[model samples]
Target: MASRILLNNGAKMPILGLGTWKSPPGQVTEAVKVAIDVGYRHIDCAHVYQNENEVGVAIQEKLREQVVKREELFIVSKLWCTYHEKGLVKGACQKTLSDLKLDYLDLYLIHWPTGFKPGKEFFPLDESGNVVPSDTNILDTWAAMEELVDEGLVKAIGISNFNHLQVEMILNKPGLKYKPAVNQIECHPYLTQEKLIQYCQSKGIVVTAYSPLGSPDRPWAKPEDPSLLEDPRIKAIAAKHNKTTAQVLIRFPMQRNLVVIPKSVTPERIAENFKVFDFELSSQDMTTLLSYNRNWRVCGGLSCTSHKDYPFHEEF
Candidate 1:
């Protein structure tokens, strides 16, 4: 396992986690098992992943086989966009808890700032295929999140894909019971979110880097999209350190003190991704890599730009 960091909520989170965003349902169970056996103390999951039952099964097997105990592992799940209403928050969290076969989650995050119509479907759409949005305030949803901690369903609560100002709204909300413990966002060489990360950390909120490897397998990826793994600039740095581009990318966020989650279902690659603790990127190399930041975001919320609480409107 990688190192652990103390969150503002007094919870310890592993700096490296297994991301289950696009992990195939058929392979995620085995992937989870291999990751646990190979040394990954944290697993980042979400209700939108649509495979938590399989992930739960793997965790059940690992615990049954004595691979790792419940308390030794950190499992994270996020509430979906459709369930951002104050009323729907607990049900969504309970559903994930039941799906993961756990009594409680180590961390639960609001999946996105934008809210969708709460109903049976994941993405309720109009005739034009545009997403139907809800006007529920995210702060109201967060107030519901605090109740989860009171009920012992989740240990810590956080936000994902939120810009600085959105987080400020949560942080400065009056009568706030517990502050958000982390801000999970997309951070990589191409989209290094330095300013926001620093601001959040300065306020004692940790940051988690999702899509650290640039999410090459994203469903909407186009043929013309640049590949961070294949980028020659990253490859040259990897070559200098005698490491793979993936390892360099994984190490980049950790060197900057941000938790990183890189996803993979291939057993070999799963094991390879965990072997990043043996080396450190030099200061000069780190500076050179930081210069590659283009302020480009891979998981842009283009579809929901019209939503009232759209997060990308303001610069982070």
Candidate 2:
């Protein structure tokens, strides 16, 4: 088992988790099984990933073999943007619950601050190729999320891709039932997210680092994009520690006391990513890595910048 962080809701979450963003349907099932076999008790998933059914298959198999109990695993899923309306929250959560073959999620996050049109189309777009934004207020959506905790559908609720001011708005909302337990964001050496991470921790909101390895496989990657894994400075640090670059990247956020979820479908890499607990990056190396921050974001929600609650507009 990995180290756990105590959430504000009094639930302990593992600091490291297996990310399922780009893991395809056919391959994700085996990937989940491999991760569980290698002792990963936390699995990060979202409805938009479109592979929860396959992930559930692996979880059920492991449970059947007595490898891990439902209580022993910390499963996470997100409510998609299309379901942000107060009336639609529960149904969306139920759908994810049904797909994962689980009674409840350990944590359920509002996938993004922006809400899209409420319908079957995941990314309802205009003729000009822009995302159609819905007028749903985040506070209204948050009220519905609080109900999930009350109804026992989720142990905790959170926000994702939200900037500091947006998080502040939630914290300051009148009659707020539950503060966000975690803030999932794109974090890596190039996008160290120092200010946001510091502010979240100060306010008792745990930060989860997605794409900690810089998401080299991100779909929007251009030929000129710099790869975090291939960076020479990171390679030198990895060499000094006799570890792989991925291991170093995973360890970075772990040392910062933030949760990290790195995605992989390869068995060897899955096992390798979990081997980060044995090593520690020195203070100087940590400083050097922090110096590489350039505010680069891999999964910047560029398509939805026009949305009322688009988070990246702030400088955090």
Candidate 3:
């Protein structure tokens, strides 16, 4: 897609971005550099990824080499669960800014609606193995995010892994300074997220689909779980288009006007994922592809279900 989606603030975001979720820290710098060199202008990053410094170094290198200007890139980062406190928000964002070596972010997201105790630990767990939660509500945390926008630390603010009800709360919130421009979620053929996508778009919010290839390499993946890449229907469709399953999977969201970010560390695969811009999927291909939706989530946040604000508990 040549055109980028206009955010609620009139900022343009590239439809395709390089996802850095599972990218090894050692390989992330090279992946970022290569992604910029190849054609990607948008990069989805987060402090929880634990590789922002490496990603930053790559961005610095590209800028130094005059490959692309800072303004040409749409850089995104997120606030982790532990930093959900209203007082803790700016410090968390400043840390991410320092890590990414950027003065400002194009988009900043609340990583998850659930809150955890603010501390050095990423996942602060109690003796019972349940996450120690902060009493701070996400609405309070979002107010601080709005302050970040006012402070010019980030141009746009959004939410990740939030259900429709949570998004509705954010929209209807009193004294809301900025509307969320995006709601990111784990969406793919098996978990199409049609209802949530439609809901977000209807409210002038864009839906960013993470784990678009079913996240086969996710840490929690079990052998019993189905693989989207290996599905016979997807394979048959790929064969029809003379493309690989990966291409078909990535292209599916692109056709639906949803922003897609497919993560990769392998150089060949990184470059291969960006080749979707050239081809067009037929109506029949789209029908068969979308018909595989069974609402099966790859990154089901089961561990955090006990948290009161967990997004997956809702129907949407």
- Runs of candidate 2 exceeding 4 Å displacement: none
Across 203-314, the per-residue lDDT of candidate 3 in tens digits comes to: 9999899998999889988999889999998999999888899999999988887899999988899899999988889988888888898889887778899999988889
The models' CA-based lDDT, in order, is 0.92, 0.94, 0.92
Each model's Cα RMSD: 1.1, 1.0, 0.9
Candidate number of the best lDDT: 2
- The 10-residue segment of model 1 with minimum total lDDT is 1-10
lDDT of 2 by residue, 54-155 (tens): 999999899999999989999999999999888899999999999999999999999999999999999998899998888888989999999999999999
Of candidate 2, the 10-residue stretch with the lowest lDDT total is 299-308
Better of 2 and 3 by lDDT: 2
Error of 3 at 36 (Å): 0.5
Prediction 3 TM-score vs. true? 0.98
Please give the lDDT score for candidate 1. Answer: 0.92
